[PDB]
Amino acid sequence: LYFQGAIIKNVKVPDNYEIKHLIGRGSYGYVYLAYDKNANKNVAIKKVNRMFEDLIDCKRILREITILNRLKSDYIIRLHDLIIPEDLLKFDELYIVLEIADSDLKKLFKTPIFLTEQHVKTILYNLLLGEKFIHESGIIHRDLKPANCLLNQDCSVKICDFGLARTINTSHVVTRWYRAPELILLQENYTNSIDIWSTGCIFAELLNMMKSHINNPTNRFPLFPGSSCFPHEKSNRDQLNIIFNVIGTPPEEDLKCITKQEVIKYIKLFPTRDGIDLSKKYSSISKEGIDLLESMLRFNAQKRITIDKALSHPYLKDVRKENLENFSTEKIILPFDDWMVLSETQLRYIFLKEIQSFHADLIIPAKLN
Ligand SMILES: Nc1ncnc2c1ncn2[C@@H]1O[C@H](COP(=O)(O)OP(=O)(O)NP(=O)(O)O)[C@@H](O)[C@H]1O
């Protein structure tokens, strides 16, 4: 006769944080509502377990933490605190304290509520302002999806979950539904256009919330749900399949970017087909709206609409705030680099320095230098 309210049990955090309840979960973390006595505010606390088993996963959480700690924007979720581990040399857990948000787009999409088109617009624009800041800081998030676009009741969007981000120069559930084809196809280089693609996918799901497109909330679906999310060739073949089913086999101009012969030949062996007509799928929105949607979802990363053009797109004139597009921020420097293979030792050092940024007096063990 166990109590389900024993989900709070595993969460051990300094006494100034009062754990209230569970709010959300992903493939890596469970996150909890908590009240902070010292700051007088609600916060979110992400707990990540088993964090040195796999070192690729370890690096992931370091990247998430180091990025958010060096970002300063109302459109990116704030890093409120990092809790000192009790065992500084052998800790396998980490408590990440974040600015709280009311919700997230994945939750909204499941709720039995309908949005107006102004809502859709307000939200997409807010998302794009966030992506702009990510760009101007010389980062590509690389894994934008409904789960990591947090939402507040006033329609403001806060981006999170930067563990897959890259800089501009075990087994888990893995969602490939918002991945750009170039990424699916594993091409050498890529730009922020990768985040615009993801934005297009999200936009389709924002469009689903209008009653005139979908009368019954039960039946809102992602645009590209091809890949299976549970544990390279087959998963990506299905994800590439469904993308072509929607936007079409690509034309020759789109294939000129590609470097490797075998990839072109892989592509070319998907039977030629035309897209769906998205105007017919989303037939309550203007031709401008559909233009914005179709521009974000171009196979050609080069022809895909840019952040700046999406912000200034006529479909969003009604909500645009050119005042907020113009800000000044520098390219952040991360305390490690993408290529760097790093030891447990070295990764524990960098964690503790970040934790030290929030806790001035923390002393890093000599063993970890
Ligand atoms: N600051 C926050 N405020 C409120 N809810 C949050 C916050 N951060 C995360 N959540 C909720 O927790 C979920 C998981 O967060 P996320 O950062 O994706 O965890 P993760 O497992 O570490 N990353 P992923 O596996 O890519 O989802 C989100 O989809 C939200 O429902």
PDB file of N, CA and C in Angstrom, residues 92-191:
ATOM      1  N   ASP A  92      27.265  11.008  -8.231  1.00  0.00           N
ATOM      2  CA  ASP A  92      26.711  10.534  -9.511  1.00  0.00           C
ATOM      3  C   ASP A  92      25.366  11.188  -9.855  1.00  0.00           C
ATOM      4  N   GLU A  93      24.946  12.133  -9.010  1.00  0.00           N
ATOM      5  CA  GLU A  93      23.685  12.858  -9.156  1.00  0.00           C
ATOM      6  C   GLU A  93      23.959  14.370  -9.271  1.00  0.00           C
ATOM      7  N   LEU A  94      22.974  15.125  -9.748  1.00  0.00           N
ATOM      8  CA  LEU A  94      23.102  16.566  -9.839  1.00  0.00           C
ATOM      9  C   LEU A  94      21.727  17.194  -9.866  1.00  0.00           C
ATOM     10  N   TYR A  95      21.550  18.223  -9.035  1.00  0.00           N
ATOM     11  CA  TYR A  95      20.311  18.980  -8.961  1.00  0.00           C
ATOM     12  C   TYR A  95      20.461  20.363  -9.616  1.00  0.00           C
ATOM     13  N   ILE A  96      19.763  20.545 -10.732  1.00  0.00           N
ATOM     14  CA  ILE A  96      19.813  21.758 -11.519  1.00  0.00           C
ATOM     15  C   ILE A  96      18.558  22.558 -11.193  1.00  0.00           C
ATOM     16  N   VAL A  97      18.738  23.763 -10.667  1.00  0.00           N
ATOM     17  CA  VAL A  97      17.636  24.611 -10.263  1.00  0.00           C
ATOM     18  C   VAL A  97      17.462  25.673 -11.334  1.00  0.00           C
ATOM     19  N   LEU A  98      16.242  25.804 -11.847  1.00  0.00           N
ATOM     20  CA  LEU A  98      15.930  26.682 -12.967  1.00  0.00           C
ATOM     21  C   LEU A  98      14.779  27.607 -12.642  1.00  0.00           C
ATOM     22  N   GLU A  99      14.692  28.697 -13.403  1.00  0.00           N
ATOM     23  CA  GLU A  99      13.501  29.526 -13.435  1.00  0.00           C
ATOM     24  C   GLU A  99      12.314  28.626 -13.720  1.00  0.00           C
ATOM     25  N   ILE A 100      11.202  28.875 -13.033  1.00  0.00           N
ATOM     26  CA  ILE A 100      10.006  28.066 -13.199  1.00  0.00           C
ATOM     27  C   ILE A 100       9.252  28.640 -14.359  1.00  0.00           C
ATOM     28  N   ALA A 101       8.544  27.777 -15.081  1.00  0.00           N
ATOM     29  CA  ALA A 101       7.625  28.209 -16.102  1.00  0.00           C
ATOM     30  C   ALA A 101       6.306  27.468 -15.872  1.00  0.00           C
ATOM     31  N   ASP A 102       5.213  27.996 -16.411  1.00  0.00           N
ATOM     32  CA  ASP A 102       3.890  27.430 -16.160  1.00  0.00           C
ATOM     33  C   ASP A 102       3.714  26.121 -16.878  1.00  0.00           C
ATOM     34  N   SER A 103       4.267  26.017 -18.084  1.00  0.00           N
ATOM     35  CA  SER A 103       4.009  24.864 -18.927  1.00  0.00           C
ATOM     36  C   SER A 103       5.037  24.714 -20.036  1.00  0.00           C
ATOM     37  N   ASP A 104       4.656  23.995 -21.081  1.00  0.00           N
ATOM     38  CA  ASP A 104       5.541  23.749 -22.207  1.00  0.00           C
ATOM     39  C   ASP A 104       4.662  23.327 -23.361  1.00  0.00           C
ATOM     40  N   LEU A 105       5.185  23.374 -24.575  1.00  0.00           N
ATOM     41  CA  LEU A 105       4.320  23.265 -25.726  1.00  0.00           C
ATOM     42  C   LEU A 105       3.798  21.841 -25.888  1.00  0.00           C
ATOM     43  N   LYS A 106       4.564  20.857 -25.411  1.00  0.00           N
ATOM     44  CA  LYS A 106       4.158  19.456 -25.445  1.00  0.00           C
ATOM     45  C   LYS A 106       2.949  19.204 -24.548  1.00  0.00           C
ATOM     46  N   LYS A 107       2.928  19.831 -23.365  1.00  0.00           N
ATOM     47  CA  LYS A 107       1.772  19.776 -22.502  1.00  0.00           C
ATOM     48  C   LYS A 107       0.563  20.482 -23.149  1.00  0.00           C
ATOM     49  N   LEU A 108       0.779  21.682 -23.684  1.00  0.00           N
ATOM     50  CA  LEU A 108      -0.315  22.475 -24.256  1.00  0.00           C
ATOM     51  C   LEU A 108      -1.024  21.694 -25.361  1.00  0.00           C
ATOM     52  N   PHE A 109      -0.230  21.015 -26.175  1.00  0.00           N
ATOM     53  CA  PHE A 109      -0.736  20.311 -27.335  1.00  0.00           C
ATOM     54  C   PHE A 109      -1.660  19.184 -26.924  1.00  0.00           C
ATOM     55  N   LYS A 110      -1.440  18.642 -25.734  1.00  0.00           N
ATOM     56  CA  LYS A 110      -2.295  17.621 -25.163  1.00  0.00           C
ATOM     57  C   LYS A 110      -3.543  18.154 -24.452  1.00  0.00           C
ATOM     58  N   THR A 111      -3.510  19.394 -23.962  1.00  0.00           N
ATOM     59  CA  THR A 111      -4.665  19.976 -23.260  1.00  0.00           C
ATOM     60  C   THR A 111      -5.885  20.160 -24.180  1.00  0.00           C
ATOM     61  N   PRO A 112      -7.114  20.036 -23.638  1.00  0.00           N
ATOM     62  CA  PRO A 112      -8.332  20.130 -24.456  1.00  0.00           C
ATOM     63  C   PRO A 112      -8.795  21.569 -24.698  1.00  0.00           C
ATOM     64  N   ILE A 113      -7.844  22.478 -24.913  1.00  0.00           N
ATOM     65  CA  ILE A 113      -8.124  23.899 -25.095  1.00  0.00           C
ATOM     66  C   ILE A 113      -7.815  24.210 -26.547  1.00  0.00           C
ATOM     67  N   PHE A 114      -8.427  25.278 -27.052  1.00  0.00           N
ATOM     68  CA  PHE A 114      -8.157  25.759 -28.392  1.00  0.00           C
ATOM     69  C   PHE A 114      -7.490  27.113 -28.348  1.00  0.00           C
ATOM     70  N   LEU A 115      -6.493  27.306 -29.209  1.00  0.00           N
ATOM     71  CA  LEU A 115      -5.888  28.617 -29.396  1.00  0.00           C
ATOM     72  C   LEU A 115      -6.508  29.353 -30.569  1.00  0.00           C
ATOM     73  N   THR A 116      -6.507  30.672 -30.464  1.00  0.00           N
ATOM     74  CA  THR A 116      -6.794  31.561 -31.585  1.00  0.00           C
ATOM     75  C   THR A 116      -5.535  31.684 -32.393  1.00  0.00           C
ATOM     76  N   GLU A 117      -5.648  32.222 -33.599  1.00  0.00           N
ATOM     77  CA  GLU A 117      -4.493  32.383 -34.465  1.00  0.00           C
ATOM     78  C   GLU A 117      -3.528  33.458 -33.926  1.00  0.00           C
ATOM     79  N   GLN A 118      -4.035  34.420 -33.166  1.00  0.00           N
ATOM     80  CA  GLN A 118      -3.156  35.404 -32.555  1.00  0.00           C
ATOM     81  C   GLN A 118      -2.255  34.716 -31.525  1.00  0.00           C
ATOM     82  N   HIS A 119      -2.829  33.779 -30.770  1.00  0.00           N
ATOM     83  CA  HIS A 119      -2.056  32.954 -29.832  1.00  0.00           C
ATOM     84  C   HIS A 119      -0.929  32.216 -30.540  1.00  0.00           C
ATOM     85  N   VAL A 120      -1.282  31.466 -31.576  1.00  0.00           N
ATOM     86  CA  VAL A 120      -0.284  30.772 -32.379  1.00  0.00           C
ATOM     87  C   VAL A 120       0.856  31.696 -32.789  1.00  0.00           C
ATOM     88  N   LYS A 121       0.505  32.870 -33.307  1.00  0.00           N
ATOM     89  CA  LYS A 121       1.463  33.854 -33.778  1.00  0.00           C
ATOM     90  C   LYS A 121       2.321  34.391 -32.641  1.00  0.00           C
ATOM     91  N   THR A 122       1.680  34.768 -31.557  1.00  0.00           N
ATOM     92  CA  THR A 122       2.394  35.318 -30.429  1.00  0.00           C
ATOM     93  C   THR A 122       3.456  34.351 -29.954  1.00  0.00           C
ATOM     94  N   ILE A 123       3.090  33.065 -29.909  1.00  0.00           N
ATOM     95  CA  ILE A 123       3.984  32.006 -29.411  1.00  0.00           C
ATOM     96  C   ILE A 123       5.137  31.738 -30.374  1.00  0.00           C
ATOM     97  N   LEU A 124       4.852  31.650 -31.670  1.00  0.00           N
ATOM     98  CA  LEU A 124       5.909  31.386 -32.651  1.00  0.00           C
ATOM     99  C   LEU A 124       6.931  32.515 -32.682  1.00  0.00           C
ATOM    100  N   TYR A 125       6.440  33.742 -32.583  1.00  0.00           N
ATOM    101  CA  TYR A 125       7.305  34.926 -32.603  1.00  0.00           C
ATOM    102  C   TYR A 125       8.212  34.882 -31.388  1.00  0.00           C
ATOM    103  N   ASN A 126       7.630  34.637 -30.213  1.00  0.00           N
ATOM    104  CA  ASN A 126       8.420  34.527 -28.983  1.00  0.00           C
ATOM    105  C   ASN A 126       9.493  33.450 -29.058  1.00  0.00           C
ATOM    106  N   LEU A 127       9.173  32.351 -29.738  1.00  0.00           N
ATOM    107  CA  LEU A 127      10.112  31.268 -29.952  1.00  0.00           C
ATOM    108  C   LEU A 127      11.259  31.760 -30.822  1.00  0.00           C
ATOM    109  N   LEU A 128      10.925  32.455 -31.906  1.00  0.00           N
ATOM    110  CA  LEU A 128      11.912  32.942 -32.863  1.00  0.00           C
ATOM    111  C   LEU A 128      12.853  33.999 -32.229  1.00  0.00           C
ATOM    112  N   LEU A 129      12.340  34.824 -31.306  1.00  0.00           N
ATOM    113  CA  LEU A 129      13.204  35.801 -30.592  1.00  0.00           C
ATOM    114  C   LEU A 129      14.233  35.060 -29.780  1.00  0.00           C
ATOM    115  N   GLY A 130      13.825  33.933 -29.203  1.00  0.00           N
ATOM    116  CA  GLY A 130      14.752  33.089 -28.466  1.00  0.00           C
ATOM    117  C   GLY A 130      15.811  32.521 -29.384  1.00  0.00           C
ATOM    118  N   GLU A 131      15.394  32.008 -30.535  1.00  0.00           N
ATOM    119  CA  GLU A 131      16.356  31.416 -31.439  1.00  0.00           C
ATOM    120  C   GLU A 131      17.357  32.501 -31.877  1.00  0.00           C
ATOM    121  N   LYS A 132      16.880  33.717 -32.157  1.00  0.00           N
ATOM    122  CA  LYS A 132      17.776  34.819 -32.537  1.00  0.00           C
ATOM    123  C   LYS A 132      18.893  35.002 -31.515  1.00  0.00           C
ATOM    124  N   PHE A 133      18.523  35.083 -30.239  1.00  0.00           N
ATOM    125  CA  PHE A 133      19.506  35.200 -29.168  1.00  0.00           C
ATOM    126  C   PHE A 133      20.502  34.050 -29.133  1.00  0.00           C
ATOM    127  N   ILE A 134      20.017  32.851 -29.440  1.00  0.00           N
ATOM    128  CA  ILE A 134      20.860  31.670 -29.515  1.00  0.00           C
ATOM    129  C   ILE A 134      21.860  31.852 -30.644  1.00  0.00           C
ATOM    130  N   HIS A 135      21.386  32.352 -31.775  1.00  0.00           N
ATOM    131  CA  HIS A 135      22.241  32.607 -32.924  1.00  0.00           C
ATOM    132  C   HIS A 135      23.284  33.651 -32.578  1.00  0.00           C
ATOM    133  N   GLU A 136      22.845  34.796 -32.065  1.00  0.00           N
ATOM    134  CA  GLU A 136      23.762  35.912 -31.846  1.00  0.00           C
ATOM    135  C   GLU A 136      24.788  35.565 -30.792  1.00  0.00           C
ATOM    136  N   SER A 137      24.517  34.548 -29.967  1.00  0.00           N
ATOM    137  CA  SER A 137      25.526  34.003 -29.054  1.00  0.00           C
ATOM    138  C   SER A 137      26.374  32.914 -29.666  1.00  0.00           C
ATOM    139  N   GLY A 138      26.164  32.607 -30.939  1.00  0.00           N
ATOM    140  CA  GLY A 138      27.016  31.650 -31.647  1.00  0.00           C
ATOM    141  C   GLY A 138      26.773  30.225 -31.195  1.00  0.00           C
ATOM    142  N   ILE A 139      25.497  29.889 -31.017  1.00  0.00           N
ATOM    143  CA  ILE A 139      25.088  28.558 -30.593  1.00  0.00           C
ATOM    144  C   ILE A 139      23.991  28.036 -31.534  1.00  0.00           C
ATOM    145  N   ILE A 140      23.978  26.739 -31.753  1.00  0.00           N
ATOM    146  CA  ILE A 140      22.870  26.064 -32.409  1.00  0.00           C
ATOM    147  C   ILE A 140      22.363  25.100 -31.355  1.00  0.00           C
ATOM    148  N   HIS A 141      21.082  25.192 -31.039  1.00  0.00           N
ATOM    149  CA  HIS A 141      20.468  24.363 -30.024  1.00  0.00           C
ATOM    150  C   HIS A 141      20.423  22.920 -30.486  1.00  0.00           C
ATOM    151  N   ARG A 142      19.979  22.704 -31.714  1.00  0.00           N
ATOM    152  CA  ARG A 142      20.124  21.401 -32.403  1.00  0.00           C
ATOM    153  C   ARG A 142      19.082  20.369 -32.001  1.00  0.00           C
ATOM    154  N   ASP A 143      18.289  20.682 -30.986  1.00  0.00           N
ATOM    155  CA  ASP A 143      17.263  19.769 -30.531  1.00  0.00           C
ATOM    156  C   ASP A 143      16.016  20.436 -29.983  1.00  0.00           C
ATOM    157  N   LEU A 144      15.541  21.468 -30.685  1.00  0.00           N
ATOM    158  CA  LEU A 144      14.314  22.157 -30.349  1.00  0.00           C
ATOM    159  C   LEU A 144      13.113  21.220 -30.556  1.00  0.00           C
ATOM    160  N   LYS A 145      12.211  21.192 -29.585  1.00  0.00           N
ATOM    161  CA  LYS A 145      11.033  20.351 -29.701  1.00  0.00           C
ATOM    162  C   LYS A 145      10.048  20.838 -28.682  1.00  0.00           C
ATOM    163  N   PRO A 146       8.775  20.399 -28.799  1.00  0.00           N
ATOM    164  CA  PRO A 146       7.757  20.927 -27.911  1.00  0.00           C
ATOM    165  C   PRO A 146       8.106  20.797 -26.434  1.00  0.00           C
ATOM    166  N   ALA A 147       8.827  19.749 -26.048  1.00  0.00           N
ATOM    167  CA  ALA A 147       9.124  19.511 -24.658  1.00  0.00           C
ATOM    168  C   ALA A 147      10.063  20.585 -24.062  1.00  0.00           C
ATOM    169  N   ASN A 148      10.908  21.203 -24.882  1.00  0.00           N
ATOM    170  CA  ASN A 148      11.913  22.137 -24.368  1.00  0.00           C
ATOM    171  C   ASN A 148      11.643  23.575 -24.763  1.00  0.00           C
ATOM    172  N   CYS A 149      10.406  23.826 -25.204  1.00  0.00           N
ATOM    173  CA  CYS A 149       9.864  25.182 -25.371  1.00  0.00           C
ATOM    174  C   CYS A 149       8.865  25.431 -24.254  1.00  0.00           C
ATOM    175  N   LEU A 150       9.354  25.956 -23.124  1.00  0.00           N
ATOM    176  CA  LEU A 150       8.529  26.135 -21.932  1.00  0.00           C
ATOM    177  C   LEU A 150       7.612  27.309 -22.219  1.00  0.00           C
ATOM    178  N   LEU A 151       6.482  27.361 -21.527  1.00  0.00           N
ATOM    179  CA  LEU A 151       5.437  28.320 -21.809  1.00  0.00           C
ATOM    180  C   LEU A 151       4.870  28.923 -20.515  1.00  0.00           C
ATOM    181  N   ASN A 152       4.587  30.210 -20.555  1.00  0.00           N
ATOM    182  CA  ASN A 152       3.895  30.879 -19.462  1.00  0.00           C
ATOM    183  C   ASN A 152       2.530  31.381 -19.918  1.00  0.00           C
ATOM    184  N   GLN A 153       1.643  31.582 -18.952  1.00  0.00           N
ATOM    185  CA  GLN A 153       0.246  31.929 -19.217  1.00  0.00           C
ATOM    186  C   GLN A 153       0.078  33.186 -20.077  1.00  0.00           C
ATOM    187  N   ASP A 154       1.080  34.076 -20.062  1.00  0.00           N
ATOM    188  CA  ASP A 154       1.062  35.274 -20.913  1.00  0.00           C
ATOM    189  C   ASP A 154       1.581  35.028 -22.339  1.00  0.00           C
ATOM    190  N   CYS A 155       1.907  33.781 -22.671  1.00  0.00           N
ATOM    191  CA  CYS A 155       2.322  33.369 -24.034  1.00  0.00           C
ATOM    192  C   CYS A 155       3.815  33.486 -24.317  1.00  0.00           C
ATOM    193  N   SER A 156       4.574  33.917 -23.309  1.00  0.00           N
ATOM    194  CA  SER A 156       6.016  33.988 -23.419  1.00  0.00           C
ATOM    195  C   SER A 156       6.639  32.588 -23.409  1.00  0.00           C
ATOM    196  N   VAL A 157       7.662  32.416 -24.242  1.00  0.00           N
ATOM    197  CA  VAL A 157       8.312  31.142 -24.462  1.00  0.00           C
ATOM    198  C   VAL A 157       9.711  31.224 -23.897  1.00  0.00           C
ATOM    199  N   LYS A 158      10.117  30.211 -23.144  1.00  0.00           N
ATOM    200  CA  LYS A 158      11.485  30.111 -22.685  1.00  0.00           C
ATOM    201  C   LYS A 158      12.135  28.781 -23.086  1.00  0.00           C
ATOM    202  N   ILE A 159      13.213  28.882 -23.863  1.00  0.00           N
ATOM    203  CA  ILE A 159      13.901  27.719 -24.381  1.00  0.00           C
ATOM    204  C   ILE A 159      14.804  27.151 -23.290  1.00  0.00           C
ATOM    205  N   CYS A 160      14.963  25.820 -23.295  1.00  0.00           N
ATOM    206  CA  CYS A 160      15.787  25.084 -22.322  1.00  0.00           C
ATOM    207  C   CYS A 160      16.440  23.911 -23.012  1.00  0.00           C
ATOM    208  N   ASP A 161      17.094  23.054 -22.226  1.00  0.00           N
ATOM    209  CA  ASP A 161      17.552  21.755 -22.690  1.00  0.00           C
ATOM    210  C   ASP A 161      18.663  21.806 -23.785  1.00  0.00           C
ATOM    211  N   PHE A 162      19.737  22.565 -23.507  1.00  0.00           N
ATOM    212  CA  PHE A 162      20.801  22.843 -24.489  1.00  0.00           C
ATOM    213  C   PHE A 162      21.915  21.788 -24.548  1.00  0.00           C
ATOM    214  N   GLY A 163      21.683  20.623 -23.965  1.00  0.00           N
ATOM    215  CA  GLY A 163      22.668  19.536 -23.966  1.00  0.00           C
ATOM    216  C   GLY A 163      23.114  18.972 -25.314  1.00  0.00           C
ATOM    217  N   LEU A 164      22.335  19.215 -26.364  1.00  0.00           N
ATOM    218  CA  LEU A 164      22.718  18.788 -27.729  1.00  0.00           C
ATOM    219  C   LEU A 164      23.300  19.956 -28.553  1.00  0.00           C
ATOM    220  N   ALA A 165      23.375  21.143 -27.961  1.00  0.00           N
ATOM    221  CA  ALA A 165      23.796  22.317 -28.691  1.00  0.00           C
ATOM    222  C   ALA A 165      25.236  22.198 -29.155  1.00  0.00           C
ATOM    223  N   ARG A 166      25.561  22.896 -30.225  1.00  0.00           N
ATOM    224  CA  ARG A 166      26.920  22.976 -30.676  1.00  0.00           C
ATOM    225  C   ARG A 166      27.223  24.425 -30.941  1.00  0.00           C
ATOM    226  N   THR A 167      28.499  24.760 -30.911  1.00  0.00           N
ATOM    227  CA  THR A 167      28.935  26.135 -31.077  1.00  0.00           C
ATOM    228  C   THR A 167      29.199  26.458 -32.551  1.00  0.00           C
ATOM    229  N   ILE A 168      28.968  27.718 -32.926  1.00  0.00           N
ATOM    230  CA  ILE A 168      29.265  28.219 -34.275  1.00  0.00           C
ATOM    231  C   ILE A 168      30.750  28.614 -34.346  1.00  0.00           C
ATOM    232  N   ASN A 169      31.496  28.007 -35.274  1.00  0.00           N
ATOM    233  CA  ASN A 169      32.965  28.224 -35.370  1.00  0.00           C
ATOM    234  C   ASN A 169      33.443  28.843 -36.695  1.00  0.00           C
ATOM    235  N   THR A 170      24.649   4.185 -22.429  1.00  0.00           N
ATOM    236  CA  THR A 170      23.325   3.658 -22.110  1.00  0.00           C
ATOM    237  C   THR A 170      22.400   3.757 -23.340  1.00  0.00           C
ATOM    238  N   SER A 171      21.107   3.485 -23.142  1.00  0.00           N
ATOM    239  CA  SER A 171      20.087   3.722 -24.165  1.00  0.00           C
ATOM    240  C   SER A 171      18.911   4.531 -23.592  1.00  0.00           C
ATOM    241  N   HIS A 172      18.419   5.470 -24.401  1.00  0.00           N
ATOM    242  CA  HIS A 172      17.345   6.373 -23.999  1.00  0.00           C
ATOM    243  C   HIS A 172      16.280   6.428 -25.054  1.00  0.00           C
ATOM    244  N   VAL A 173      15.123   6.974 -24.673  1.00  0.00           N
ATOM    245  CA  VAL A 173      14.104   7.396 -25.646  1.00  0.00           C
ATOM    246  C   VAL A 173      14.627   8.636 -26.396  1.00  0.00           C
ATOM    247  N   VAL A 174      14.649   8.531 -27.729  1.00  0.00           N
ATOM    248  CA  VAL A 174      15.242   9.532 -28.637  1.00  0.00           C
ATOM    249  C   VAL A 174      14.202   9.984 -29.674  1.00  0.00           C
ATOM    250  N   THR A 175      13.791  11.241 -29.590  1.00  0.00           N
ATOM    251  CA  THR A 175      12.778  11.774 -30.496  1.00  0.00           C
ATOM    252  C   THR A 175      13.441  12.451 -31.693  1.00  0.00           C
ATOM    253  N   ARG A 176      13.199  11.897 -32.882  1.00  0.00           N
ATOM    254  CA  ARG A 176      13.801  12.379 -34.117  1.00  0.00           C
ATOM    255  C   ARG A 176      12.819  13.183 -34.979  1.00  0.00           C
ATOM    256  N   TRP A 177      11.641  13.481 -34.433  1.00  0.00           N
ATOM    257  CA  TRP A 177      10.550  14.042 -35.224  1.00  0.00           C
ATOM    258  C   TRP A 177      10.736  15.505 -35.655  1.00  0.00           C
ATOM    259  N   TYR A 178      11.663  16.195 -35.004  1.00  0.00           N
ATOM    260  CA  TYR A 178      11.931  17.596 -35.241  1.00  0.00           C
ATOM    261  C   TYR A 178      13.320  17.825 -35.828  1.00  0.00           C
ATOM    262  N   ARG A 179      13.982  16.751 -36.248  1.00  0.00           N
ATOM    263  CA  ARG A 179      15.333  16.836 -36.803  1.00  0.00           C
ATOM    264  C   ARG A 179      15.355  17.157 -38.289  1.00  0.00           C
ATOM    265  N   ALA A 180      16.171  18.151 -38.636  1.00  0.00           N
ATOM    266  CA  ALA A 180      16.374  18.574 -40.008  1.00  0.00           C
ATOM    267  C   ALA A 180      16.921  17.442 -40.831  1.00  0.00           C
ATOM    268  N   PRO A 181      16.649  17.448 -42.150  1.00  0.00           N
ATOM    269  CA  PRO A 181      17.170  16.337 -42.945  1.00  0.00           C
ATOM    270  C   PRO A 181      18.691  16.304 -42.933  1.00  0.00           C
ATOM    271  N   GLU A 182      19.342  17.453 -43.081  1.00  0.00           N
ATOM    272  CA  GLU A 182      20.818  17.443 -43.064  1.00  0.00           C
ATOM    273  C   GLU A 182      21.352  16.716 -41.823  1.00  0.00           C
ATOM    274  N   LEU A 183      20.687  16.906 -40.691  1.00  0.00           N
ATOM    275  CA  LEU A 183      21.080  16.282 -39.448  1.00  0.00           C
ATOM    276  C   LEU A 183      20.780  14.808 -39.472  1.00  0.00           C
ATOM    277  N   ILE A 184      19.532  14.465 -39.793  1.00  0.00           N
ATOM    278  CA  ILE A 184      19.163  13.076 -40.077  1.00  0.00           C
ATOM    279  C   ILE A 184      20.222  12.458 -40.967  1.00  0.00           C
ATOM    280  N   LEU A 185      20.607  13.159 -42.027  1.00  0.00           N
ATOM    281  CA  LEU A 185      21.603  12.630 -42.981  1.00  0.00           C
ATOM    282  C   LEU A 185      23.068  12.737 -42.525  1.00  0.00           C
ATOM    283  N   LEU A 186      23.297  13.333 -41.350  1.00  0.00           N
ATOM    284  CA  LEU A 186      24.617  13.349 -40.708  1.00  0.00           C
ATOM    285  C   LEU A 186      25.673  14.097 -41.520  1.00  0.00           C
ATOM    286  N   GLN A 187      25.300  15.215 -42.124  1.00  0.00           N
ATOM    287  CA  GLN A 187      26.251  15.965 -42.932  1.00  0.00           C
ATOM    288  C   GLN A 187      27.263  16.721 -42.053  1.00  0.00           C
ATOM    289  N   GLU A 188      28.455  16.937 -42.615  1.00  0.00           N
ATOM    290  CA  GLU A 188      29.597  17.466 -41.873  1.00  0.00           C
ATOM    291  C   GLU A 188      29.198  18.709 -41.100  1.00  0.00           C
ATOM    292  N   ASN A 189      28.777  19.736 -41.845  1.00  0.00           N
ATOM    293  CA  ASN A 189      28.491  21.069 -41.303  1.00  0.00           C
ATOM    294  C   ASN A 189      26.996  21.374 -41.343  1.00  0.00           C
ATOM    295  N   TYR A 190      26.589  22.366 -40.557  1.00  0.00           N
ATOM    296  CA  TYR A 190      25.216  22.847 -40.532  1.00  0.00           C
ATOM    297  C   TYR A 190      25.117  24.175 -39.779  1.00  0.00           C
ATOM    298  N   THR A 191      24.089  24.951 -40.101  1.00  0.00           N
ATOM    299  CA  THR A 191      23.924  26.302 -39.601  1.00  0.00           C
ATOM    300  C   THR A 191      22.767  26.362 -38.601  1.00  0.00           C
TER     301      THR A 191
END
